[PDB]
C-alpha cells in the first residue's frame, strides 16, 4: 500500500495564503528546460513572437515551497510556462516513487486567457518500446483548474471539446473525481520536433486553486488504463497554460515532494540553508 508522508516542512496548501514578492523575471522563449539559480528545478517558457508581451517571475528557492512563480501574458499565441523537476535520465516514473504537488495560487477570471488553457502538473515521457508507434513519444497533462472560455465557465471542467481526444475512464483521488482523455496528435510540435505522438490527460472534475496532487497516483491510472508512460520521464513541472487573452496567474505556493510506499520524504524543498 502506500501511505501518504507526515512531515513538518510539507507546507498545508490550505494555509499557504500569502502573497510572495521579490525573484528573478523572465520575459522570452528559453530553449527548453533552464536550470533555476540554487534551486533543483528547471523552468521552461515558450513567448511567441506575434506582439503579444509575457513574463515570468520565479520566487525563489527559499519561499513559497521552492517552485512557486507568478507570470502574466498580453495577447499571446499559446503562452506556455512551467517549473519543477527535470529529468530526462531514462528512468521510468516509478523510479521517482512518490511524487506529490502542494499549491496555492491566484489568477484573473473566466475569459482572461482565450479558448483553451489549462493550470496544473505537465510533462512528457519516452515509451521506445511501445508496439503502437504513435505511443513513443507521450505528452501529459494533470489538470487542476482553467480559466474556461465563452462557452464553459472556468468553475466547470473542460471536456474533449477543447482537449481533443477520447475519453477513457475516470478514478477519484486527492478529493475530485478526474476524467481520463487520450489523444493521438498526428504530425504536431513535440520536444522530438513535428511528430505522432500521445497525449494523456486527467481533467479534474471539480477545479481548484488550492490543494495537493497525488501526481504517482495518475501515472498510475493511466498505466492501469492501457496508457503506458514507458521507461524515460522527461519532466514533471507545474505549468500553466493561455491560449490566448490577457491575463495572470500568481501562485504563494508550489512545492514538490517525493516519499516512498511508507511516506518516508526522499526529497523536499527548500533545502536547509546550514
Given at each position: 500500500?502506500?501511505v501518504?508522508?507526515?512531515?513538518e516542512?510539507?507546507?498545508?496548501?490550505?494555509?499557504?495564503?500569502?502573497?510572495?514578492?521579490?525573484?528573478?523575471?523572465?520575459?522570452?522563449?528559453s530553449?527548453?528546460?533552464k536550470?533555476?539559480?540554487?534551486?533543483?528545478?528547471?523552468?521552461?517558457?515558450?513567448?511567441?513572437?506575434?506582439?503579444?508581451?509575457?513574463?515570468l517571475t520565479?520566487?525563489?528557492?527559499?519561499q513559497g515551497?521552492?517552485?512557486?512563480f507568478?507570470?502574466?501574458?498580453?495577447?499571446?499565441?499559446?503562452?506556455?510556462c512551467?517549473?519543477?523537476?527535470?529529468?530526462n535520465?531514462?528512468?521510468?516514473?516509478s523510479?521517482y516513487?512518490?511524487?506529490?504537488?502542494?499549491?496555492?495560487?491566484?489568477?484573473?477570471?473566466?475569459?482572461?486567457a482565450?479558448?483553451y488553457?489549462y493550470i496544473?502538473?505537465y510533462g512528457?515521457?519516452?515509451?521506445?518500446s511501445?508496439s503502437?508507434?504513435?505511443?513513443r513519444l507521450?505528452e501529459?497533462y494533470?489538470?487542476?483548474?482553467?480559466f474556461?472560455?465563452?462557452?464553459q465557465?472556468?468553475?466547470?471542467?473542460?471536456?474533449?471539446?477543447?482537449t481533443?481526444?477520447?475519453?477513457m475512464?475516470?478514478?477519484t483521488?486527492?478529493?475530485?473525481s478526474y476524467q481520463?482523455?487520450?489523444?493521438?496528435?498526428?504530425?504536431?510540435?513535440?520536444?522530438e520536433?513535428?511528430?505522432?505522438?500521445?497525449?494523456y490527460?486527467s481533467?479534474?472534475?471539480?477545479?481548484?486553486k488550492?490543494?495537493?496532487?497525488?501526481?504517482?497516483?495518475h501515472?498510475?491510472?493511466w498505466?492501469?488504463?492501457?496508457?503506458?508512460l514507458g521507461?524515460?520521464?522527461?519532466?514533471?513541472?507545474?505549468?500553466?497554460?493561455?491560449?490566448a487573452?490577457?491575463?495572470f496567474?500568481?501562485?504563494?505556493?508550489?512545492?514538490?515532494?517525493?516519499a516512498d510506499?511508507?511516506?518516508?520524504?526522499?526529497?523536499?524543498?527548500?533545502?536547509?540553508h546550514?
Open positions: 500500500q502506500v501518504k508522508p507526515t512531515d516542512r510539507i507546507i498545508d496548501p490550505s494555509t499557504a495564503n500569502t502573497q510572495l514578492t521579490g525573484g528573478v523575471t523572465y520575459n522570452t522563449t530553449g527548453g528546460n536550470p533555476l539559480a540554487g534551486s533543483p528545478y528547471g523552468y521552461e517558457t515558450w513567448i511567441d513572437t506575434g506582439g503579444g508581451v509575457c513574463s520565479w520566487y525563489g528557492a527559499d515551497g521552492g517552485a512557486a507568478k507570470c502574466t501574458w498580453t495577447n499571446p499565441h499559446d503562452f506556455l512551467r517549473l519543477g523537476y527535470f529529468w535520465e531514462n528512468k521510468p516514473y523510479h516513487e512518490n511524487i506529490y504537488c502542494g499549491f496555492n495560487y491566484t489568477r484573473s477570471g473566466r475569459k482572461t482565450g479558448d488553457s496544473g502538473i512528457w515521457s519516452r515509451n521506445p511501445a503502437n508507434s504513435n505511443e507521450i501529459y494533470i489538470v487542476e483548474d482553467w474556461g472560455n465563452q462557452w465557465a472556468d468553475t466547470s471542467p473542460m471536456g474533449i471539446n477543447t481533443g481526444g477520447t475519453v475512464g475516470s478514478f483521488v486527492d478529493g475530485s481520463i482523455i487520450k489523444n493521438t496528435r498526428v504530425n504536431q510540435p513535440s520536444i520536433g513535428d511528430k505522432t505522438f500521445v497525449q490527460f481533467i479534474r472534475q471539480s477545479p481548484r488550492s490543494g495537493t496532487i497525488s501526481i504517482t497516483e501515472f498510475k491510472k498505466e492501469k488504463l492501457g496508457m503506458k521507461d524515460n520521464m522527461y519532466e514533471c513541472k507545474f505549468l500553466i497554460e493561455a491560449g487573452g490577457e491575463g496567474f500568481d501562485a504563494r505556493l508550489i512545492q514538490f515532494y517525493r510506499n511508507e511516506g518516508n520524504i526522499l526529497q523536499i524543498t527548500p533545502l536547509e546550514h
